[PDB]
Amino acid sequence: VYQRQFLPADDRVTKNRKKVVDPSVKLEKIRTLSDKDFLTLIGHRHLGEAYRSVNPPLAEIGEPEDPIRELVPPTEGAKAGDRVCTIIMTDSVYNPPIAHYTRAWMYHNRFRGIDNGVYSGRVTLEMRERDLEEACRTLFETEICDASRDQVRQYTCTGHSCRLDPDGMMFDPIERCIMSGGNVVYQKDSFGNPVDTPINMGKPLSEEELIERTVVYRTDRGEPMTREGDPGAPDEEVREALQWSRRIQWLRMLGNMVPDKIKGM
Amino acid sequence: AYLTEKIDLYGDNGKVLESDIPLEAVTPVQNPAVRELASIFKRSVAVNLGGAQKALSTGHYANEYIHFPDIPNKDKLGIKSSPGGKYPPKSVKVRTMDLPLVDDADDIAARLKERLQVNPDDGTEVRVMKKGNVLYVKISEQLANTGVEYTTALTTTAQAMTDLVMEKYDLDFHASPLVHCAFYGRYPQTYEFMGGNVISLLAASCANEGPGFAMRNIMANHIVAATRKRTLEAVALSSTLEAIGHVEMGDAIGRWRRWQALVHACQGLNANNVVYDLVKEAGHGCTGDVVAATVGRALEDGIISVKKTLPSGYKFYTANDPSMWNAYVCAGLVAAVIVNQGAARAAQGVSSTLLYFNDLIEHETGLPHAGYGDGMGNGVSFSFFSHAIYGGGSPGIFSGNHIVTRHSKGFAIPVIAAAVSLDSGTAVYGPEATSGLVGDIFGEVDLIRRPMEAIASAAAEIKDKF
Amino acid sequence: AYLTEKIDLYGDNGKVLESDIPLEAVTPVQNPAVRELASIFKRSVAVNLGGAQKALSTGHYANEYIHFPDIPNKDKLGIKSSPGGKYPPKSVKVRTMDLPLVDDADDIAARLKERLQVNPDDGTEVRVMKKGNVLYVKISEQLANTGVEYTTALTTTAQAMTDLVMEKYDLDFHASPLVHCAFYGRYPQTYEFMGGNVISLLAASCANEGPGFAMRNIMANHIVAATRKRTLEAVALSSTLEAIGHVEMGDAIGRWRRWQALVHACQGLNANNVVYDLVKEAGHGCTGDVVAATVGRALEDGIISVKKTLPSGYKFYTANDPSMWNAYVCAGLVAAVIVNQGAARAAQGVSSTLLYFNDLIEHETGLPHAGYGDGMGNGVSFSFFSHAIYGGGSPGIFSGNHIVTRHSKGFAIPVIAAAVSLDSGTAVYGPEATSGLVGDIFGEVDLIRRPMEAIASAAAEIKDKF
Amino acid sequence: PKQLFLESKNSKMNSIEMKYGQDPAINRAEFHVYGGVRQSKRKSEAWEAAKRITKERGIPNYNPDLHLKGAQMGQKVLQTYRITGLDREWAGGEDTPAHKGWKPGTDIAGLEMDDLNYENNPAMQQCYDDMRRTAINGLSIAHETIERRFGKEVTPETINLYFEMLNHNIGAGAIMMEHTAETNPELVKDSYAKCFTGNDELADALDQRFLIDINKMFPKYQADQIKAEVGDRIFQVARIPTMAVRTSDGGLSRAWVGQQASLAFLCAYDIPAGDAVTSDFVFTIKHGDVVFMGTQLPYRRAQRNNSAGGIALGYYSDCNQTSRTPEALEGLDGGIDPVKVIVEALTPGCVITDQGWLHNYLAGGSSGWSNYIISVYTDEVLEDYGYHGAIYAMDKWKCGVGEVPNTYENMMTIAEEVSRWSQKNYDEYPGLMEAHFGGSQRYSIQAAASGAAVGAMTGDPDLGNAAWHYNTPLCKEHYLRLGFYGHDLQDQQNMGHTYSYRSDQGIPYELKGPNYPDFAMNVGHMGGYIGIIAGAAHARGAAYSTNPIIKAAFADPNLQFDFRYPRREFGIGGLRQFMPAGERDAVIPPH
């Protein structure tokens, strides 16, 4: 089996990107959530409630004779015929440990049977309900979730690009996520609905921790993707992400003119 | 010049169907089975006798809840129809009639075949199906090729049906518009035979996005219903229809011909078993595992090689065969959808796999993805228009002619057919809802339902010509 | 059942071409010449190399006075292009180029044929015309019948020209859109290859009034230009295209098949020399003399007879053969236009003759005119829309697909072709103005220019089959 | 010398700071303290009007308390906007049919988002109506038929009488018939007809009230180019009533002028009623010698001529008249300013294709997607980035506009620098990042600024637009986010389609349009391309980019909308100071 390289990682930022997307790299658990609080935060089903179904169990729907289908084991959610549910998260532009396109690349590399959309203000993940619950343990409890910069919100998602609040928290129009006693807590669920007791997410990471683990380039901290003098400079004098970007543009342009033009290039 | 490079055609079970086939022998311009497929779509129509009979009987003509009301109880409505109620109200019956079309389906079939037939040994066929409720008709090549259009089976069948019903039951003049409506629906107020009872697999000839798009204006749900959800046969039918469409669009020409033919061979006909091998290797994994398998297979086959190693250790790959690299990305694309949407047994994520399998490929190799931008482009548009308020719909309603998904040069619709084939019934606008009659009737045509083996056998028949 | 009744086919000189021909042998569903005519329209296109070269050279791309300007004298415009005029202005050339397409026409035709051809000896043809300014292209039946559409010659030729010009002159990336524009014009922003340099005799495939109307969307000026104004050959070409169109519309079916076939034979092919005989008898007279000759010939041939004599002495005639009576009225209709518009050598009155020849016929016999209302109906619409502010135009711009003249079932457009053929140059939108290239290039095809003899010879080849 | 979004060149206004009353470089804000919609004058007034409406009609309507989960809109600042560059204008102070003369150099600041919503802004609606109600035709064939078929001479005198008659019947009256109904002149005072010609002797012989004067409207070098294309020919420009297109579509224009021009020919030349020549006049107007603003569209989005969807990008470029203004001719320190042309031409380019067409034809709703598009013509943001690329290239290549060699390499260099500068400012100014809170706004703006700089500096419109698509990796690999869900369909594919020649991929940018498949669905793009096409032509010394007849046809002070200063006009509509045409006041009860 060929060993993936995922993306050019020549600096701290792109190396953080590679860690997030490489499935052979364990994302460190940084918080514990009870099953009741975890399910309450998702807001689709509560602890002990039976899973709803969109179609009968896979074994009863009479799948046709299809050899290729036999090569792809169905997930447990697919076998049960669970509803496909959506979870949405938003990452601030201010030094998050995971950003939007890295979520798509990570989801497609770490989770089976997904649907996922990337937007500037949010990222959706839609899977068979029980499969989604298992995926959410990684999204909510590991190093890719700084409680103040990566939040869950099903709608009225504005905040990724807004200025941080006095406590360094990302804005939430519905105020699902608040700062209480130094801890970030969810006082409402992902749908903005009331919760019996707030879900404590713990402390946010310090600024230096955020800068160390971030996947985004930012000009203000002296780490832009394109530095002054890089435009037009030779490939060897610029970031590997820019050398990669220039190569993709050259090959898409020449290849789409005449395919043979990119042979050996 | 002929596309002489040899490929092996494999079936959906991963076993070889035909070996040493020149790429030229599977192209729509040469392959008799692919050409016969287009001929079948052009010449075949279904007559819904049950629908025609019900429309005439109750007055529910055409679509949109239309109803021409006949009132059989006028004297019980509590109204006076004569000044001062001089004369009691009397009902009339002027918009409906009861004709035993379904009970006479056999005789009607014989009369329709004689009207459509040009010469006795011409190939015209009319079959009675659904216990008389539907007739499957296939006009002769002689009648179909009289002029230049593909709608002759539709137009002639609607008129032959209308004429023969008027004659058989010796109907009075009042019946002429009503019987015409039973078969034509709202035509000619509409260009389509809207709400009528003569159906073609092709769309109305006014609906193309451009010249040559007729074979592309076929919903993925129709393809899945006709192949009865057998994943790779749905991929083969969709890819073959897109291959014919691209020839008609003028894009299987000159320096782009090999590139276009390889998309069809590699993604649609499991050439060299690439699709099957990739699914087999990465089936227990994610989209990413298909990316790893695709790059590995391209390297193993000498399609790509390391071009340069950057200081970080990241390697840029070069395409030793750019058109074959594109075709390997198209094969990996359908494999990725089979693995990802196959694990969930839910088609919705197909648009996400279309986008990110290609995006991961570029980030992994430094080579362009399928269509030099169209694969990710359609991944974006298709994702957007299958999860937003703006338009679109569920995956199965898209086609090569839909404004949202038309762009990719033949490698996008086949992945939708694969995903919808693997769906466990998670949509409301699924194949049963939009393509029930299509699957029950046209799905009986062996060539439409199982094209893979038919294309391979026809390619072997002419393999020595090139 | 076969249309076994025998007819004699006469040429425009009034001499028999073929005797004892069953009506069935001239129908579009059987006659090889009529079928080959439709095949030629589908597969032929013209490439205007002079036009393409001029568009690239000056920037006058497409139509509507479009011009992408290149300014070669920027330093003489009296403007400063640098702040404070620090640097003097320098001109650039970015939207135009000079390619010797016309001088290289022979080699261009060779490269175009290789790209269009599917197999050696498949019948693909590329002919250099107008000293290199135009190429006549006819794709193979193999390429043309790949899919279901009739636009393949147009689409493949435009892409083949674009690709071969980019390759032949090894043009840089900037040229791709400009060379595409030189052949495709505004496509795909427009569905048509608008203002492009690849022309078909058929209209864009989005333009039909209904299914099967493609062979009807051909202006009378094109027909006259292609037949070089030889009156009855223009009538034959127009009537034959309307005959193919009516088959594709589904109207040459069942109880209407004989009626439709007789319109074509009697009005379009001078069957039994009726058209010629009527013109010969009444040529020195008026429309009314043709009415007298038509009724007399119908009586002589036993088509009509006196039904009843009213007290005043006026006689009602009965049709012993209603479909043949209609066909004799259609023949008299084209004869009347030849006599009336022929005497003036001015086409405008054709619309009046269409209306009043039919109106006089009914008043004279008490029998219905051509099309049971359509002949007078189109005389009315066509008269109105060729002499009013509302729309329309001069006679030559109408066709079987024009909303104004589409109604008649194949017997109206041929009379427009006859009148425009006899016109002495009284219109501004005449054949030279709208169809110069059509007549010069497609008029060289013997089948298109002189179909009468070709149809008769082909009918004699299969006469014993019926 | 600060960025234009922190200090406007002449008025010295800080467009970003004015939104918050706080330094935009500070990453801190207080939320949930503005009273929700109470902070908005327009939404607060809308709420009170809605209560009256509900009481009158018996059905509820606007109700801000319906906002999801008790969170009224306005939990953050509902920013106001400033029209870009109005303080740098010095010409165009003439009275127009829609408003008294604007004082050039006066700013328009503090506009609320609802004031720049296409649904609430009559200047934006009139902009589109003026495009689609226009019919253009060459008159050579009608004059030829009169002289050759009818037998009468055509002279300046008969042309003048023809135009006097056409101006009488185009909107209001009848000339030939007895007992004929007519339209109230008040309802069609915006309808009239004119002509232009390259023949100066003919131009000087006509009644100037019916003439579009090329010599007056354009600078000498541009008038010379246009007249050389027009030549010794007469072109008619007729504008049918705005009220009429509002009861139907733009395809009515050629049919309407077909009727009225035919009648004016019959009456001015004494042609008998029903003469065969009549059909040549309507055929000439509708098909024989006609120029349309828009071509027909296919079945899924079916349209006759003159719908916004059929308008080629180059035609949107050429109907803009900023190219002939003093600001565009000597704004760059006495030199031509192609950037002024790009930034103005993209304003109706964006608003008409995105709000007028994608929204008001293909989708819809109450928002007009206004904030998405407002970002491209307000607060000097895109202005700063665009001028940054021009100054950078002029200094690097030591040349003027339109003179940087049009190589793929130079396009990539400029794009990288403009993307860098765009990202630098969004990163260093949290208040600006929050102002353009939608990623599409920020992504489209760096792509448009890059294309504007490449187009203005090389004079190559396809290369200028190629720079737009190259911004996809530059943007994505920096932020790891782009725009809305379906924003990069065209950006991804045009990285390859720009120089492709496949059937529906290849086509020059001048002739692309909303029916080019890649562009048929999404906002935030087409207008930018339109600006780039106009600026590239301007930079290389040209008077137009695609059609000289379209450029001349819109050089008309009788147009309801001022096509020379669109950003300003949209601002005037934002102030509720633009009087559109088409209102039915004359025949409705008082109000």
Ligand SMILES: C[C@@H](OP(=O)(O)O)[C@H](NC(=O)CCCCCCS)C(=O)O
């Ligand atoms: C997609 C298609 O809609 P359907 O899927 O055909 O219903 C199409 N609408 C659009 O393209 C909507 C464009 C505006 C909304 C997106 C703004 S980014 C149309 O009306 O023909």
Ligand SMILES: C[C@@H](OP(=O)(O)O)[C@H](NC(=O)CCCCCCS)C(=O)O
């Ligand atoms: C004839 C045709 O016009 P053209 O000949 O195509 O210009 C058609 N107009 C009309 O039908 C005009 C109908 C109204 C005027 C007559 C009222 S009696 C149309 O717009 O397509």
Ligand SMILES: O=S(=O)(O)CCS
């Ligand atoms: O959220 S989506 O990107 O689908 C629409 C943005 S208006």
Ligand SMILES: [Cl-]
């Ligand atoms: Cl239909």
Ligand SMILES: [Cl-]
């Ligand atoms: Cl329909």
Ligand SMILES: [Cl-]
């Ligand atoms: Cl030339």
Ligand SMILES: [Cl-]
């Ligand atoms: Cl065309």
Ligand SMILES: [Cl-]
């Ligand atoms: Cl008969």
Ligand SMILES: [K+]
């Ligand atoms: K470096």
Ligand SMILES: [K+]
């Ligand atoms: K029934």
Ligand SMILES: [K+]
């Ligand atoms: K009845």
Ligand SMILES: [K+]
């Ligand atoms: K028969």
Ligand SMILES: [K+]
């Ligand atoms: K259909």
Ligand SMILES: [K+]
């Ligand atoms: K190749």
Ligand SMILES: [K+]
């Ligand atoms: K031309």
Ligand SMILES: [K+]
């Ligand atoms: K060039």
